[PDB]
Amino acid sequence: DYKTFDPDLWAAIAKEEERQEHNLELIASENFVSEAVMAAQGSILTNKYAEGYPGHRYYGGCEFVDIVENLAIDRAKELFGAKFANVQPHSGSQANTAAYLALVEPGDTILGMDLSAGGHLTHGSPVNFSGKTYHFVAYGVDPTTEVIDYNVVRILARKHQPKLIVAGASAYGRTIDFAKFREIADEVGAKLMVDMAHIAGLVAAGLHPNPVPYADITTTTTHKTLRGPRGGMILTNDEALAKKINSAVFPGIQGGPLEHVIAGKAVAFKEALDPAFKEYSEQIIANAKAMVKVFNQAIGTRVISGATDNHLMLIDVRELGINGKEAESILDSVNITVNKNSIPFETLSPFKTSGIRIGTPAITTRGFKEEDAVKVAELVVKALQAKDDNAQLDEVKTGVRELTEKFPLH
Amino acid sequence: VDYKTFDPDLWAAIAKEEERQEHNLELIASENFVSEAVMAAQGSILTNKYAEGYPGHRYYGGCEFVDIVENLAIDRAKELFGAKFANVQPHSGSQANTAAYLALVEPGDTILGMDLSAGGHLTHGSPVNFSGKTYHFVAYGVDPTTEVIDYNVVRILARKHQPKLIVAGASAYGRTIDFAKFREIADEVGAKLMVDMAHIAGLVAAGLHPNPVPYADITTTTTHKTLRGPRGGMILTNDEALAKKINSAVFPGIQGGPLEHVIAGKAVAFKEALDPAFKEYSEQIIANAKAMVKVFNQAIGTRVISGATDNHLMLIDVRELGINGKEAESILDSVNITVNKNSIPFETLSPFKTSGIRIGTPAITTRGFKEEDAVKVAELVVKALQAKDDNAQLDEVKTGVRELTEKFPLH
Ligand SMILES: O=c1c2cc(O)c(O)cc2oc2cc(O)c([C@@H]3O[C@H](CO)[C@@H](O)[C@H](O)[C@H]3O)c(O)c12
Ligand SMILES: O=c1c2cc(O)c(O)cc2oc2cc(O)c([C@@H]3O[C@H](CO)[C@@H](O)[C@H](O)[C@H]3O)c(O)c12
Ligand SMILES: Cc1ncc(COP(=O)(O)O)c(CN[C@@H](CO)C(=O)O)c1O
Ligand SMILES: Cc1ncc(COP(=O)(O)O)c(CN[C@@H](CO)C(=O)O)c1O
C-alpha cells in the first residue's frame, strides 16, 4: 500500500480530513466538492499535455481529452448563457490576468472596487500584477449605508475617464447592479468587466442578476458557490474578444492546461445543471439571512450594511473589544473557522482589521437548514461574548460537536 | 460507481483516455505516468482548503495540516536539488517563470534566451508570450552543422547586447547544457543567470546531468516531466534576498490561492525521487533514448538533430521522407504512437507544419521498457514513416505496438 511508504504525508492529509469533519467551515469562499469532482482531479488526465484548444492541439493523442474540455466549455455556456467560454485558466487570478490583457494596455486607467470595501486583490492592489501593470482607481461603499453609491461611481468614472470598469467583489454581501455599471461604463466610453467568482453559483441558479449579458468579459473561479475544483474561467458574448481571450490564456500567460482539473470543472458544471443545485443555492441564501438576523439582534456584532442578499456577511467586532485577528483566533479555539477581514473605512492595519467574514456555502453543502444556521450564529456570538470564560467556550465546542455530528461530511 | 452513472458523457471520456494511455506508445518528451500515490493526493480533500500565504503565515485560519504538506514538499525539494530556498506554489512552469522574471528584471530589460526553433521554450522570449511581450529578448541558437549550442556565440551576443539576465534551459534540446560556461558568460557581462530545468529536472535530481542550482541565481522547473510528478511548477534559489522577491512575486504577485492537493502530489513525487530506485529509472531513460537515437541514425530518412542525445529526448528531421512534422505526427497517431510535431533548428516551414517530430523516453521507461524495447519502438516509428501509407506495413506497426503495450501494461 502506497500510504505505508510516506506516513508523514498521508498522516497530515488524514488530519486535514478530520479537521474538515470536526470544524464549522464558515470561510465564505470555501466549499466541499463532490466525490466525483475529486475523482476527476485524481484521474490519469494529469498525464496528458494538451496545449491549444479542442481540435487544434499542439500534441498528438488529444482526441478524448478534447471531449472533456468540450463538456466543460459547453456546460459553462449552458449554465451562464455565454456564447464563448474558456475553461483553461489555472485560477481566478490567471482568469483576471488574461481578461485584462484582452481589454486594456499597460498603464491604462481602471476603476475597480476598493479592497477594504469588498474588492479583490486582482482588482487593483499595489502588490498585485493588477496594481503594478495598470493605473487603478477605487470606488467604495457609502459610509452610512455601506452599499455601493452608484452616483459616486459615476463621478469617479467621469473624472478619471477609465478605459475599463471592473465590478464584482470578495466581501460584498449585497446585490450588485450590473445594469448601472454598464450604463456608467457607456457614459464615459469604458468597457465593463465583471468578476463573479463569489456569486457564480447564485448566478447560475438564477438567484443573482446575471452579469454575462452586460459585461464585455465575465471572469469567475470554479470553486466558490459553484462548488467546483480550484481554477478559473472566462466568458464573453463577443467573438473578437473571445479570440483575444483565448490567445491571452495560451500562448499568452499559460502553457499546458490542467485537464484533470478541467474534468472536475465539467463534473461540477453538470451538477450545477441539476435542479437540486437551485435548491442548494436557495438554502445558501436563506441560511445567510438567518445568520444575519441573529447577529443583528446580538450585542456587539454589527452586520456591515445591516443585511445580506447573497452567501456572505461582514461582522464589525470592535464593540466586543477585539479586532478581526482576535475574533478569528477565538473562533478557531472552538472549532469555528472564519477569516479576519477589513470593513468599509477600516481604521486598523490589514494584519488586525475590525471584522470577520462569514459565509454559508460550505455548511449548506453539509446539509445545514435555517434552524442549524441560526444555532451557528448563536454559537459565534457566545464565543465572542465569552471574554476569557473557558466555561462558556467549552459549551460552544460542545455545540459545534453537536452540529458536526448531526451533519456528517466524510 | 453511481456518480459515473450521473455523468456518462464525462466518465466515458476518461475511460477512453485510460484505454488510449494503455494501448499507445506515449513518446511525447514532456509527458510521464505518475504513481497512484500522486493521483490519490490530487484527488484528496485538500482541494477544499483556501491557503493563501505561506506555511505559518496564512491569510486564513485552519491551515495547520496543509502547512505540514507544503513544508514536506518545500523541504523535500531543497533536499532533492540542494537549494537553500524553494517555492512549490506555482501553478505551472509558465507561472514559475513569470514569477522568476519578476524577481530578476524590470519590464523592457534585455534578456538573452535560447531561440524557440533551436530548442528554447515559449517563455524564453517568444513574442506571442508574456516573456517576449514584457522584456527585450535576444536569442541564441545552435550551430548549423553540429546543432549544439556555440558558447562563443553566446558570449559574443552577451557582450554586444549587455543583457541584465541570461536564461538557459530548453524544451527541445537533447544535449548537455554547460551551466558553468553560462555562469562565466553572465559574470563577464554582469548579468544574472536563470536556468529553466523543467525537462531535465529528474535527470538533475539523479545526478545524470550537471546541476544548475549552484550556478543560477534562480532555477525554475515543472514537476511533471522527468520528475514524474503532478502538473505544476517550482522555483529554487540559494540567495535569501531573491527568495523573498520570489515568494512575493508568486503571491500576492501573480497567483492567489495555491493548489494544495497538487502540492500534496509534489511532496509525494519528491519523496519518490529521493528513493535510490529513482536514479536507476533516470539512467534507463537515457539508455533508452540513446538506443533510439542509434536506430534513427542508421535509418534512411530519419535524421537526428545533432546526431546524438545526452538526455531523455531527441528531435528528428523528417523532411527527407517527403513529409512535414504535422504529417508525421498524424501518421504515427494512426498507428497508436503519440508524438508531437516540433520545429528543428533553422526551421524552413510554417509553425503549423514544422520539419520534425520530438520523441522522449520518460513515459515508456516508466512502463518498464528496456533498451531492446526502446530499439523496437524506434524501428516501429521508422517503419511507419517509411510506409508510404501502405496499410500492410502500418498494421504491422499496430501489431508491434500491441505487443509492447501488452508486454508492459500500465496497471
Ligand atoms: O492586501 C493584501 C496584501 C498586502 C501586502 O503588502 C502583501 O505583501 C500581501 C497581501 O496579501 C493579501 C491577501 C489577501 O487575501 C487580501 C484580501 O483578503 C480578503 C480575505 O477575505 C479578501 O476579501 C480580499 O479579496 C483579498 O484580496 C489582501 O488584501 C492582501
Ligand atoms: O509558437 C507557438 C505558438 C504561436 C501562436 O501564435 C499560437 O497561437 C500558439 C503557439 O503555440 C505554441 C506551442 C508550442 O508547444 C510551441 C513550442 O513547441 C516545442 C515543444 O512542443 C518547443 O520547441 C517549445 O518549447 C514550445 O514552446 C510553440 O513555439 C508555439
Ligand atoms: C472575486 C475574486 N476574483 C479572483 C479571486 C482569486 O482566485 P484564485 O485564488 O483562484 O487565484 C478571488 C478569491 N478571493 C479570496 C481572497 O483573496 C477569497 O477568499 O475570497 C475572488 O474572490
Ligand atoms: C523548459 C520548459 N519550461 C516551462 C514550460 C511550461 O510549463 P507549463 O506547461 O506547465 O506551463 C515548459 C513546457 N514544455 C512544453 C513546451 O510547450 C513541452 O511539451 O515540452 C518547458 O518545456
Short mmCIF file of N, CA and C in Angstrom, two decimals, chain A residues 2 5-6 8-10 12 15-17 19-20 27 29-33 35-36 38-49 57-61 63-64 67-68 71 75 90-91 93-94 121 127-129 223-224 230 250-255 257-258 260 263 266-267 270 274 328 337-339, chain B residues 3 6-7 9-11 13-14 16-18 20-21 26 28 30-34 37 39-50 60-62 65 68-69 72 76 91-92 94-95 122 128-130 224-225 231 252-259 261 264 267-268 271 329 333 338-341 352 358:
data_model
loop_
_atom_site.label_atom_id
_atom_site.label_comp_id
_atom_site.label_asym_id
_atom_site.label_seq_id
_atom_site.Cartn_x
_atom_site.Cartn_y
_atom_site.Cartn_z
N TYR A 2 0.54 2.21 -0.87
CA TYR A 2 1.41 3.36 -1.09
C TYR A 2 1.49 4.28 0.13
N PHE A 5 4.54 3.95 2.56
CA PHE A 5 5.86 4.46 2.23
C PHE A 5 6.04 5.94 2.53
N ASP A 6 4.96 6.67 2.79
CA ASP A 6 5.04 8.10 3.10
C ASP A 6 4.07 8.44 4.23
N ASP A 8 4.34 10.34 6.80
CA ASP A 8 4.29 11.74 7.22
C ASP A 8 3.30 12.52 6.38
N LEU A 9 3.29 12.27 5.07
CA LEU A 9 2.38 13.00 4.20
C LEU A 9 0.95 12.56 4.43
N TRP A 10 0.71 11.25 4.36
CA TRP A 10 -0.65 10.76 4.44
C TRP A 10 -1.25 10.93 5.83
N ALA A 12 -0.75 13.72 7.62
CA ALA A 12 -1.19 15.11 7.56
C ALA A 12 -2.49 15.25 6.78
N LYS A 15 -5.32 14.02 8.96
CA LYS A 15 -5.65 15.05 9.95
C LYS A 15 -6.43 16.21 9.33
N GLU A 16 -6.15 16.54 8.07
CA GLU A 16 -6.94 17.60 7.44
C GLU A 16 -8.34 17.12 7.13
N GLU A 17 -8.50 15.83 6.85
CA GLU A 17 -9.85 15.30 6.66
C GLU A 17 -10.65 15.33 7.96
N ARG A 19 -10.05 17.55 10.40
CA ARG A 19 -10.29 18.96 10.69
C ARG A 19 -11.52 19.46 9.95
N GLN A 20 -11.68 19.05 8.69
CA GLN A 20 -12.87 19.46 7.95
C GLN A 20 -14.12 18.82 8.54
N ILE A 27 -15.60 30.09 6.23
CA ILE A 27 -14.93 30.94 5.25
C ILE A 27 -15.80 31.05 4.01
N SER A 29 -15.52 31.81 0.91
CA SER A 29 -15.05 31.36 -0.39
C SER A 29 -14.76 29.87 -0.43
N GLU A 30 -15.09 29.12 0.61
CA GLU A 30 -14.80 27.70 0.61
C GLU A 30 -16.08 26.89 0.42
N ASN A 31 -15.89 25.63 0.03
CA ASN A 31 -16.99 24.70 -0.19
C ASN A 31 -16.42 23.30 -0.05
N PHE A 32 -17.29 22.30 -0.20
CA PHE A 32 -16.88 20.89 -0.21
C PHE A 32 -17.36 20.30 -1.53
N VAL A 33 -16.41 19.96 -2.41
CA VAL A 33 -16.75 19.40 -3.70
C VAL A 33 -17.16 17.94 -3.54
N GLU A 35 -17.58 13.81 -4.46
CA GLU A 35 -16.63 12.73 -4.69
C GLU A 35 -16.30 12.58 -6.17
N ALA A 36 -17.25 12.88 -7.05
CA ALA A 36 -16.98 12.86 -8.49
C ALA A 36 -15.96 13.93 -8.87
N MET A 38 -13.57 15.16 -7.00
CA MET A 38 -12.26 14.71 -6.52
C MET A 38 -11.72 13.54 -7.34
N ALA A 39 -12.60 12.63 -7.78
CA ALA A 39 -12.15 11.53 -8.63
C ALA A 39 -11.65 12.03 -9.99
N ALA A 40 -12.33 13.01 -10.59
CA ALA A 40 -11.82 13.61 -11.82
C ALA A 40 -10.41 14.17 -11.62
N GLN A 41 -10.22 14.93 -10.53
CA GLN A 41 -8.92 15.53 -10.25
C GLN A 41 -7.87 14.47 -9.94
N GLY A 42 -8.29 13.30 -9.45
CA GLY A 42 -7.35 12.23 -9.19
C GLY A 42 -7.21 11.23 -10.33
N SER A 43 -7.59 11.59 -11.56
CA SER A 43 -7.58 10.65 -12.68
C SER A 43 -6.28 10.75 -13.47
N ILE A 44 -6.18 9.91 -14.51
CA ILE A 44 -4.99 9.88 -15.37
C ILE A 44 -4.93 11.06 -16.32
N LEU A 45 -5.94 11.95 -16.30
CA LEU A 45 -5.87 13.12 -17.16
C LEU A 45 -4.69 14.01 -16.82
N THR A 46 -4.14 13.91 -15.61
CA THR A 46 -2.96 14.69 -15.27
C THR A 46 -1.77 14.36 -16.16
N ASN A 47 -1.78 13.21 -16.85
CA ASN A 47 -0.65 12.77 -17.66
C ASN A 47 -0.60 13.38 -19.06
N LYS A 48 -1.66 14.05 -19.52
CA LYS A 48 -1.76 14.48 -20.91
C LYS A 48 -1.33 15.94 -21.09
N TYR A 49 -0.34 16.18 -21.97
CA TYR A 49 -0.06 17.53 -22.47
C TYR A 49 -1.04 17.88 -23.56
N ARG A 57 -4.84 21.20 -31.19
CA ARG A 57 -3.83 20.97 -30.17
C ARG A 57 -2.45 20.96 -30.81
N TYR A 58 -1.43 21.13 -29.97
CA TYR A 58 -0.03 21.06 -30.38
C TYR A 58 0.62 19.72 -30.04
N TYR A 59 -0.17 18.71 -29.65
CA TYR A 59 0.33 17.37 -29.37
C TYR A 59 -0.59 16.33 -29.99
N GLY A 60 -0.03 15.17 -30.31
CA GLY A 60 -0.86 14.03 -30.63
C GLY A 60 -1.63 13.51 -29.43
N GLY A 61 -2.64 12.69 -29.72
CA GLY A 61 -3.33 11.93 -28.69
C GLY A 61 -4.40 12.64 -27.89
N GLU A 63 -7.63 13.25 -28.66
CA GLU A 63 -8.98 13.05 -29.17
C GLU A 63 -10.00 12.87 -28.05
N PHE A 64 -9.61 12.28 -26.92
CA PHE A 64 -10.58 12.10 -25.83
C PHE A 64 -10.51 13.19 -24.78
N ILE A 67 -12.96 15.83 -25.65
CA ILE A 67 -14.33 15.65 -25.16
C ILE A 67 -14.48 16.29 -23.79
N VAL A 68 -13.55 15.98 -22.88
CA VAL A 68 -13.59 16.51 -21.53
C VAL A 68 -13.62 18.04 -21.57
N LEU A 71 -16.92 19.40 -22.89
CA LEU A 71 -18.02 19.35 -21.94
C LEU A 71 -17.94 20.52 -20.96
N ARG A 75 -20.93 23.17 -21.12
CA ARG A 75 -21.79 23.30 -19.95
C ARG A 75 -21.69 24.69 -19.34
N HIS A 90 -5.79 28.51 -14.83
CA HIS A 90 -5.43 27.75 -13.63
C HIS A 90 -6.08 28.31 -12.37
N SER A 91 -6.54 29.56 -12.38
CA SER A 91 -7.07 30.16 -11.16
C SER A 91 -7.87 31.39 -11.55
N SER A 93 -7.07 34.26 -10.45
CA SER A 93 -6.06 35.29 -10.72
C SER A 93 -5.60 35.24 -12.17
N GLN A 94 -5.35 34.03 -12.70
CA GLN A 94 -4.99 33.88 -14.10
C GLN A 94 -6.13 34.30 -15.02
N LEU A 121 -7.94 41.38 -4.41
CA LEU A 121 -6.55 41.71 -4.70
C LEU A 121 -6.32 42.00 -6.19
N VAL A 127 0.42 45.55 -4.60
CA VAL A 127 1.34 44.42 -4.54
C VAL A 127 0.96 43.30 -5.50
N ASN A 128 -0.08 43.48 -6.29
CA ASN A 128 -0.57 42.52 -7.27
C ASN A 128 -0.20 42.99 -8.67
N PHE A 129 -0.12 42.03 -9.61
CA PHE A 129 0.07 42.38 -11.02
C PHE A 129 -0.91 43.45 -11.47
N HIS A 223 -14.56 27.36 -7.92
CA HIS A 223 -14.57 26.70 -6.62
C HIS A 223 -15.33 27.43 -5.50
N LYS A 224 -16.10 28.48 -5.78
CA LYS A 224 -16.73 29.05 -4.58
C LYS A 224 -18.19 28.60 -4.46
N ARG A 230 -10.63 24.09 -7.62
CA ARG A 230 -9.94 25.38 -7.74
C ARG A 230 -9.46 25.59 -9.17
N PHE A 250 -3.46 31.18 -23.66
CA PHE A 250 -2.39 30.38 -24.27
C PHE A 250 -2.24 30.83 -25.72
N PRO A 251 -1.03 31.20 -26.18
CA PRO A 251 0.28 31.09 -25.51
C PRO A 251 0.64 32.29 -24.63
N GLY A 252 -0.35 33.13 -24.31
CA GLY A 252 -0.02 34.37 -23.63
C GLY A 252 0.57 34.21 -22.24
N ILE A 253 -0.17 33.59 -21.32
CA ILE A 253 0.30 33.60 -19.93
C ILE A 253 0.38 32.19 -19.35
N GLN A 254 -0.21 31.19 -20.02
CA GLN A 254 -0.20 29.81 -19.58
C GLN A 254 0.44 28.91 -20.62
N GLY A 255 0.76 27.69 -20.20
CA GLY A 255 1.20 26.65 -21.11
C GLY A 255 0.19 25.52 -21.21
N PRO A 257 -2.74 23.13 -20.16
CA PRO A 257 -3.86 23.20 -19.22
C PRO A 257 -3.87 22.00 -18.28
N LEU A 258 -4.58 22.14 -17.16
CA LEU A 258 -4.69 21.05 -16.19
C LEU A 258 -5.97 20.28 -16.51
N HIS A 260 -7.10 17.30 -15.78
CA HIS A 260 -7.81 16.62 -14.70
C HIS A 260 -8.65 17.61 -13.91
N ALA A 263 -11.67 18.40 -16.16
CA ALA A 263 -12.69 17.36 -15.96
C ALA A 263 -13.49 17.62 -14.69
N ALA A 266 -15.94 20.22 -15.49
CA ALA A 266 -17.05 19.65 -16.24
C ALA A 266 -17.98 18.88 -15.31
N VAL A 267 -17.42 18.15 -14.35
CA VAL A 267 -18.26 17.42 -13.40
C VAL A 267 -19.13 18.40 -12.63
N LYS A 270 -22.12 20.07 -14.62
CA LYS A 270 -23.32 19.25 -14.78
C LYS A 270 -24.06 19.09 -13.45
N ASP A 274 -28.22 20.33 -12.60
CA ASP A 274 -29.31 19.57 -11.97
C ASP A 274 -30.23 20.50 -11.18
N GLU A 328 -11.08 35.88 15.05
CA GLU A 328 -10.80 34.67 14.29
C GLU A 328 -10.06 33.65 15.14
N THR A 337 -14.22 28.05 11.95
CA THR A 337 -13.25 28.65 11.03
C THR A 337 -13.88 29.81 10.28
N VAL A 338 -13.35 31.03 10.49
CA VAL A 338 -13.67 32.22 9.71
C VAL A 338 -12.38 32.81 9.15
N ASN A 339 -12.42 34.05 8.65
CA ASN A 339 -11.19 34.80 8.44
C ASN A 339 -11.42 36.26 8.84
N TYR B 3 -21.81 7.89 -9.30
CA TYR B 3 -21.55 9.20 -9.89
C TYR B 3 -21.12 9.09 -11.35
N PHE B 6 -24.35 9.20 -13.15
CA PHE B 6 -24.87 10.56 -13.27
C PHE B 6 -24.31 11.26 -14.52
N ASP B 7 -23.07 10.98 -14.90
CA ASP B 7 -22.37 11.73 -15.94
C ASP B 7 -21.62 10.77 -16.85
N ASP B 9 -21.30 11.05 -20.10
CA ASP B 9 -20.54 11.86 -21.05
C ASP B 9 -19.12 12.02 -20.57
N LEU B 10 -18.96 12.41 -19.31
CA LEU B 10 -17.64 12.72 -18.79
C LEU B 10 -16.86 11.45 -18.48
N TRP B 11 -17.49 10.51 -17.78
CA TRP B 11 -16.76 9.34 -17.30
C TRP B 11 -16.43 8.37 -18.43
N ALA B 13 -15.47 9.48 -21.30
CA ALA B 13 -14.32 10.09 -21.95
C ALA B 13 -13.05 9.77 -21.19
N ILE B 14 -13.12 9.82 -19.86
CA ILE B 14 -11.97 9.48 -19.04
C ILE B 14 -11.61 8.01 -19.23
N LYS B 16 -12.13 6.19 -21.97
CA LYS B 16 -11.44 6.10 -23.25
C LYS B 16 -10.00 6.62 -23.14
N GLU B 17 -9.78 7.67 -22.36
CA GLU B 17 -8.42 8.18 -22.27
C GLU B 17 -7.52 7.24 -21.45
N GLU B 18 -8.09 6.53 -20.47
CA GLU B 18 -7.35 5.44 -19.82
C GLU B 18 -6.97 4.37 -20.84
N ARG B 20 -6.62 4.74 -24.06
CA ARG B 20 -5.63 5.25 -25.00
C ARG B 20 -4.23 5.26 -24.38
N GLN B 21 -4.10 5.64 -23.10
CA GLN B 21 -2.78 5.60 -22.47
C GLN B 21 -2.28 4.17 -22.36
N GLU B 26 3.37 6.25 -25.71
CA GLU B 26 3.40 7.67 -25.41
C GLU B 26 4.84 8.17 -25.49
N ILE B 28 5.69 11.51 -26.25
CA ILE B 28 5.81 12.94 -26.02
C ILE B 28 6.84 13.17 -24.91
N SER B 30 7.73 15.44 -22.91
CA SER B 30 7.38 16.13 -21.68
C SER B 30 6.25 15.45 -20.92
N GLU B 31 5.86 14.26 -21.31
CA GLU B 31 4.84 13.55 -20.55
C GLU B 31 5.48 12.42 -19.74
N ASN B 32 4.69 11.89 -18.82
CA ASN B 32 5.12 10.79 -17.97
C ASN B 32 3.86 10.13 -17.42
N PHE B 33 4.04 9.14 -16.55
CA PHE B 33 2.92 8.46 -15.91
C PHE B 33 3.17 8.53 -14.42
N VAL B 34 2.32 9.26 -13.71
CA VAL B 34 2.50 9.44 -12.28
C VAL B 34 1.98 8.21 -11.54
N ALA B 37 -0.07 7.01 -5.92
CA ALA B 37 0.03 7.90 -4.76
C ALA B 37 -0.14 9.37 -5.16
N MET B 39 -1.75 10.55 -7.82
CA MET B 39 -3.15 10.75 -8.21
C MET B 39 -4.06 10.81 -6.99
N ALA B 40 -3.81 9.97 -5.99
CA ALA B 40 -4.64 9.99 -4.79
C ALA B 40 -4.47 11.29 -4.00
N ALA B 41 -3.26 11.85 -3.99
CA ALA B 41 -3.07 13.17 -3.40
C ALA B 41 -3.85 14.23 -4.16
N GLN B 42 -3.80 14.19 -5.49
CA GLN B 42 -4.52 15.19 -6.27
C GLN B 42 -6.03 15.00 -6.16
N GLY B 43 -6.48 13.79 -5.88
CA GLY B 43 -7.91 13.58 -5.70
C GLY B 43 -8.35 13.61 -4.25
N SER B 44 -7.56 14.24 -3.38
CA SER B 44 -7.83 14.30 -1.94
C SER B 44 -8.66 15.54 -1.57
N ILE B 45 -9.07 15.60 -0.29
CA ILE B 45 -9.92 16.69 0.21
C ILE B 45 -9.13 17.99 0.36
N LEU B 46 -7.82 17.95 0.11
CA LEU B 46 -7.04 19.18 0.18
C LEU B 46 -7.51 20.22 -0.84
N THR B 47 -8.26 19.80 -1.86
CA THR B 47 -8.80 20.77 -2.80
C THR B 47 -9.75 21.76 -2.13
N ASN B 48 -10.29 21.43 -0.95
CA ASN B 48 -11.27 22.28 -0.28
C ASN B 48 -10.66 23.43 0.52
N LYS B 49 -9.35 23.42 0.80
CA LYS B 49 -8.74 24.40 1.70
C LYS B 49 -8.19 25.62 0.95
N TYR B 50 -8.67 26.82 1.31
CA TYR B 50 -8.04 28.08 0.92
C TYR B 50 -6.81 28.33 1.79
N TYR B 60 -5.73 32.73 6.17
CA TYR B 60 -6.94 32.06 6.60
C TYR B 60 -6.61 31.20 7.80
N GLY B 61 -7.62 30.97 8.65
CA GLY B 61 -7.46 30.00 9.71
C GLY B 61 -7.59 28.57 9.21
N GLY B 62 -7.09 27.63 10.01
CA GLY B 62 -7.26 26.22 9.75
C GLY B 62 -6.17 25.54 8.94
N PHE B 65 -2.58 21.65 9.01
CA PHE B 65 -2.11 20.43 8.37
C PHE B 65 -1.65 20.64 6.93
N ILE B 68 1.95 21.30 7.05
CA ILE B 68 2.80 20.11 7.08
C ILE B 68 3.06 19.62 5.66
N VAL B 69 2.00 19.54 4.85
CA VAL B 69 2.13 19.02 3.49
C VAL B 69 3.03 19.93 2.66
N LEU B 72 6.55 19.72 3.79
CA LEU B 72 7.17 18.50 3.29
C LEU B 72 7.64 18.67 1.84
N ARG B 76 11.52 18.59 0.89
CA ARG B 76 11.97 17.52 0.01
C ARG B 76 12.58 18.08 -1.26
N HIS B 91 1.49 27.41 -10.14
CA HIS B 91 0.52 26.51 -10.75
C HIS B 91 1.09 25.76 -11.95
N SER B 92 2.21 26.21 -12.52
CA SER B 92 2.69 25.67 -13.79
C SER B 92 4.11 26.15 -14.01
N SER B 94 4.90 27.81 -16.56
CA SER B 94 4.77 29.18 -17.06
C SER B 94 4.67 30.17 -15.91
N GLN B 95 3.86 29.87 -14.89
CA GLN B 95 3.78 30.79 -13.75
C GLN B 95 5.10 30.84 -12.98
N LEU B 122 8.60 28.64 -25.21
CA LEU B 122 7.73 29.81 -25.35
C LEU B 122 8.05 30.91 -24.35
N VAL B 128 4.75 36.07 -28.85
CA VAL B 128 3.33 35.84 -28.56
C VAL B 128 3.11 35.44 -27.11
N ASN B 129 4.17 35.43 -26.31
CA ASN B 129 4.17 35.02 -24.92
C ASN B 129 4.44 36.24 -24.05
N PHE B 130 3.96 36.21 -22.80
CA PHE B 130 4.25 37.29 -21.87
C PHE B 130 5.74 37.64 -21.83
N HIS B 224 6.26 17.83 -13.61
CA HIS B 224 5.60 16.73 -14.31
C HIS B 224 6.38 16.12 -15.48
N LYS B 225 7.64 16.47 -15.68
CA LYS B 225 8.30 15.86 -16.83
C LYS B 225 9.16 14.68 -16.38
N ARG B 231 1.17 17.90 -12.36
CA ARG B 231 1.35 19.05 -13.24
C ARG B 231 1.47 20.31 -12.38
N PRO B 252 1.56 37.82 -3.18
CA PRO B 252 0.33 38.14 -3.93
C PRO B 252 0.55 38.62 -5.37
N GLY B 253 1.77 38.49 -5.89
CA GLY B 253 2.10 38.95 -7.23
C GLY B 253 1.28 38.43 -8.40
N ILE B 254 1.26 37.12 -8.66
CA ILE B 254 0.61 36.67 -9.89
C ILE B 254 -0.43 35.59 -9.63
N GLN B 255 -0.41 35.02 -8.43
CA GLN B 255 -1.35 33.97 -8.05
C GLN B 255 -2.13 34.38 -6.82
N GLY B 256 -3.19 33.63 -6.56
CA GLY B 256 -3.96 33.74 -5.34
C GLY B 256 -3.75 32.49 -4.52
N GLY B 257 -4.82 31.76 -4.25
CA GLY B 257 -4.71 30.51 -3.53
C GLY B 257 -3.87 29.46 -4.23
N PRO B 258 -3.00 28.78 -3.48
CA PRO B 258 -2.27 27.65 -4.06
C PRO B 258 -3.17 26.43 -4.20
N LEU B 259 -2.74 25.48 -5.01
CA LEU B 259 -3.46 24.22 -5.20
C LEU B 259 -2.85 23.20 -4.25
N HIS B 261 -3.90 20.38 -3.04
CA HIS B 261 -3.95 18.97 -3.40
C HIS B 261 -2.87 18.64 -4.40
N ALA B 264 0.37 18.51 -2.39
CA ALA B 264 0.47 17.16 -1.84
C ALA B 264 1.14 16.21 -2.82
N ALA B 267 4.86 16.79 -3.03
CA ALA B 267 5.53 16.14 -1.91
C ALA B 267 5.66 14.64 -2.14
N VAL B 268 4.59 13.99 -2.59
CA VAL B 268 4.70 12.57 -2.92
C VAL B 268 5.79 12.35 -3.96
N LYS B 271 9.44 12.72 -2.77
CA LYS B 271 9.90 11.57 -1.99
C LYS B 271 10.23 10.41 -2.91
N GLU B 329 3.38 13.36 -37.33
CA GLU B 329 2.57 13.24 -36.12
C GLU B 329 1.26 12.51 -36.39
N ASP B 333 0.17 8.79 -35.01
CA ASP B 333 -1.02 8.65 -34.18
C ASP B 333 -1.96 7.59 -34.74
N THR B 338 2.20 8.11 -30.15
CA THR B 338 1.88 9.51 -29.86
C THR B 338 3.15 10.32 -29.71
N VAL B 339 3.33 11.32 -30.59
CA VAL B 339 4.45 12.25 -30.52
C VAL B 339 3.89 13.67 -30.59
N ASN B 340 4.76 14.67 -30.67
CA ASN B 340 4.33 15.97 -31.17
C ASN B 340 5.26 16.44 -32.28
N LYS B 341 4.68 17.07 -33.30
CA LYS B 341 5.45 17.84 -34.26
C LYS B 341 6.29 18.86 -33.49
N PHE B 352 2.91 25.68 -38.19
CA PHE B 352 1.80 24.74 -38.20
C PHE B 352 2.14 23.44 -38.91
N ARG B 358 9.38 15.39 -32.15
CA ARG B 358 10.12 15.24 -30.91
C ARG B 358 9.68 13.96 -30.21
#
